[PDB]
Amino acid sequence: PVMHPHGVPPSHRPWQMKDLQAIKQEVSQAAPGSPQFMQTIRLAVQQFDPTAKDLQDLLQYLCSSLVASLHHQQLDSLISEAETRGITGYNPLAGPLRVQANNPQQQGLRREYQQLWLTAFAALPGS
Asked: Taking the alpha carbons of 60, 100, 49, 5 in that order, is the dihedral positive or negative?
């Protein structure tokens, strides 16, 4: 999670199991990628402002190996497309996207990365 205390640089803290369990008890009420799941996983991203690494750690905790694999494959396609477009706050000469999305100072880029990660869940549900 990325924290925003007043007057000092933003800082990363690791997930705590109580964070993860509280997220699971909400998100896992619904099928992955369903509208209900999307509301609750978006709320978790809002509350915790996670880095790219945090998001993979969260995916691997919440989802089965198969579901995580489907998500990761879709995300890697979305990232390729986004890099071709260009991404807010992202200078590719200053580090790979995923690395920069772990630098707490790169807020704009992290927030965009979060939206890509959230959008990747659209590959999961049945209509």
From this structure: positive
In the chain, what are the domains? 2-123 (1.10.375.10)
Question: Which residue has tokens 């209900």?
Answer: 36
Resolution in A: 0.9
Which residue, 38, 77, 117, 25, is CA-closest to 85? Answer: 77
SS3 at position 36: helix
Whether the Cβ atoms of residue 44 and residue 37 lie closer than 8 Å to each other: no
- What is the C-alpha radius of gyration for the chain, rounded to an integer number of angstroms? 14
Distances in Å between the Cα of 10 and the Cα atoms of 22, 49, 95, 107 are: 23, 11, 19, 9
b (16+ CB within 10 A) / e for 88-115: ebbeeeeeebeebbbbbebeebbebbbe
> Which amino acid is it at 117?
W
Using the Cα atoms of residue 80, residue 83, residue 89 and residue 95 in order, give the sign of their dihedral: positive
